Amino acid sequence: NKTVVVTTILESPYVMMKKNHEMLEGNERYEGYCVDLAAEIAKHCGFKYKLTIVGDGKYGARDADTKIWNGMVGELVYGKADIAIAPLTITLVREEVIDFSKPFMSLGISIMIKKGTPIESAEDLSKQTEIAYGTLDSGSTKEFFRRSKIAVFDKMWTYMRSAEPSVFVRTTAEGVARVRKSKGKYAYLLESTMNEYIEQRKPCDTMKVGGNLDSKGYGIATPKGSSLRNAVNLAVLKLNEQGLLDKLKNKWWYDKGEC
Amino acid sequence: TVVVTTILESPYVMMKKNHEMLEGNERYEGYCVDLAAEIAKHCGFKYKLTIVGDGKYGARDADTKIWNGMVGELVYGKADIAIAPLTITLVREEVIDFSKPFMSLGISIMIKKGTPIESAEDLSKQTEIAYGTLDSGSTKEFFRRSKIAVFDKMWTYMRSAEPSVFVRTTAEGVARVRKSKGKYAYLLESTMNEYIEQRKPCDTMKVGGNLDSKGYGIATPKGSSLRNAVNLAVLKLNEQGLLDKLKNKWWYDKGEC
Numbered sequence: 001n002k003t004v005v006v007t008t009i010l011e012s013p014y015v016m017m018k019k020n021h022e023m024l025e026g027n028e029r030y031e032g033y034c035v036d037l038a039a040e041i042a043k044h045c046g047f048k049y050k051l052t053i054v055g056d057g058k059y060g061a062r063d064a065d066t067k068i069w070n071g072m073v074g075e076l077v078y079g080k081a082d083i084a085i086a087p088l089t090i091t092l093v094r095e096e097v098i099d100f101s102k103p104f105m106s107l108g109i110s111i112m113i114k115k116g117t118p119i120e121s122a123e124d125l126s127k128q129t130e131i132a133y134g135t136l137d138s139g140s141t142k143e144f145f146r147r148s149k150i151a152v153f154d155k156m157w158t159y160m161r162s163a164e165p166s167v168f169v170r171t172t173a174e175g176v177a178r179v180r181k182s183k184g185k186y187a188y189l190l191e192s193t194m195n196e197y198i199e200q201r202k203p204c205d206t207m208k209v210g211g212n213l214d215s216k217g218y219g220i221a222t223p224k225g226s227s228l229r230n231a232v233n234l235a236v237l238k239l240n241e242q243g244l245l246d247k248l249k250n251k252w253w254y255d256k257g258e259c
Numbered sequence: 260t261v262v263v264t265t266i267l268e269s270p271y272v273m274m275k276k277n278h279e280m281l282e283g284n285e286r287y288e289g290y291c292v293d294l295a296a297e298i299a300k301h302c303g304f305k306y307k308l309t310i311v312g313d314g315k316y317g318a319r320d321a322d323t324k325i326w327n328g329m330v331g332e333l334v335y336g337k338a339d340i341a342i343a344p345l346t347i348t349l350v351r352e353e354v355i356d357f358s359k360p361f362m363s364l365g366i367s368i369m370i371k372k373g374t375p376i377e378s379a380e381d382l383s384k385q386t387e388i389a390y391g392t393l394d395s396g397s398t399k400e401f402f403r404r405s406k407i408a409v410f411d412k413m414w415t416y417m418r419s420a421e422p423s424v425f426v427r428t429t430a431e432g433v434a435r436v437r438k439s440k441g442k443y444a445y446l447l448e449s450t451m452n453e454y455i456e457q458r459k460p461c462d463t464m465k466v467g468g469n470l471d472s473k474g475y476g477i478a479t480p481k482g483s484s485l486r487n488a489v490n491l492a493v494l495k496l497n498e499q500g501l502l503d504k505l506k507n508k509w510w511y512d513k514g515e516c
């Protein structure tokens with residue numbers, strides 16, 4: 001078997017630089033949930049591999065003018081990498097150009113509050129205005145609310161689009177900082193995975209509340225025609241059924257946690 | 260006309276009240292009935308809903324190595340596609356193809372209200388309250404194959420338990436919980452557990468969190484000309500907000516409690 005080129009992304013706690021990474025080389029430089037995942041996938045599929053960080057540090061979107069895919073997805077479609085093992089969301093536009101395994105992690109839109117905020121659900125948020133709430137100013141979460149035919153979510157959308165000042169943010173970091181500087185009066189809506197992770201880091205002043213508002217997954221991606229597709233897919237399923245993915249999630253979110 | 264295999268399971272596929280006087284696809288109603296319509300429309304095919312012959316989900320017989328249920332119907336050419344609460348699993352994915360999940364779920368515990376049990380660990384450490392699973396489905400296989408201590412102990416008890424803790428249909432497991440005065444707890448998927456919790460006589464409840472994390476997919480036989488279109492159609496329907504609305508319509512909107 002040829003050395004498999006794995007593309008991945010520096011996003012905590014999926015892939016991070018080890019403590020002494022400057023004293024290390026190759027795959028030993030990195031650690032995290034997706035580093036452990038890549039080792040398990042390689043073992044089950046009988047390949048050796050090289051972890052490479054995606055050049056542009058992006059996930060994969062198609063430029064609407066140039067029609068060029070950036071990110072890990074571009075690296076797959078242009079033949080620059082053999083497989084992407086990262087927190088890459090399974091979406092229609094990507095599935096049209098690459099193959100995804102079944103999900104290795106389930107996630108969805110969720111509520112981030114400052115600790116002690118009287119909110120426990122989307123329902124709770126939808127029936128008041130004292131606590132302002134919002135999303136990234138563009139992307140899937142904003143559009144989820146815009147599209148939603150569910151009453152509580154349409155109610156939330158109607159509030160959010162009218163709200164002044166803007167309840168929207170340019171970046172995830174802006175949204176998190178806005179929850180923290182807000183004294184309980186702002187809730188941020190983001191993916192549960194990131195929400196649960198931030199819950200477990202210092203300052204330790206935020207928490208996740210309520211069910212997930214929708215249902216998405218991260219998948220392992222291969223270019224179309226990859227001889228790895230079937231085996232990768234089965235390996236993800238095997239690892240899930242053995243409880244290994246749950247184990248890794250617990251490890252990287254909680255065992256490594258700081259709160 | 261595509262032959263669609265499915266299973267009678269509330270609220271996915273249900274006989275309409277006036278079914279004896281109805282014909283074809285109009286006999287049935289539910290989440291998976293609505294989903295079959297959307298998928299067929301998106302993929303541009305005609306279809307007939309046919310309830311699985313043996314009323315099972317699909318397991319490989321340990322003696323004969325023959326598949327039963329919906330998986331059997333796909334693998335032996337009795338049906339072209341399965342649109343049902345069919346759990347995506349390793350052993351099935353080896354013999355048929357699944358779309359991406361149209362719904363997420365995990366194994367959960369159903370109790371008669373007031374049963375002094377709140378976790379799987381609670382259950383494993385006592386004999387007074389009997390507990391079991393559906394036969395021929397993924398939950399039984401989850402416990403059978405499990406190497407996790409708590410669930411291992413649970414399977415050991417379950418495989419030996421007298422009389423049998425296993426049931427043939429979900430409605431049987433639920434009727435058993437309701438008839439047994441707290442002496443029987445049922446292990447079922449969170450989706451169905453939550454539905455029943457919101458149905459009269461409102462005498463059951465879900466306890467603890469899910470035991471695992473998984474999804475239902477639409478299944479096709481290997482080499483099906485339908486595989487790619489169906490897979491993409493599920494993602495499109497999810498991103499449209501349509502799968503969430505359908506779940507709302509059949510769970511929350513029809514809630515009796």
Ligand SMILES: CS(=O)(=O)Nn1c(=O)[nH]c2cc([N+](=O)[O-])c(-n3ccnc3)cc2c1=O
Pocket residue numbers: 011059060087088089090091139140172193194
């Ligand atoms: C929106 S998309 O089409 O699904 N692309 N996409 C992914 O696939 N995975 C992601 C994972 C993360 N993340 O932190 O794990 C973030 N992230 C980064 C900072 N906050 C969140 C963004 C994305 C992201 O944008």
Ligand SMILES: N[C@@H](CCC(=O)O)C(=O)O
Pocket residue numbers: 316317344345346347393395396397398399446447448
């Ligand atoms: N959805 C399961 C059946 C229900 C259960 O096992 O609890 C399957 O496809 O096998």
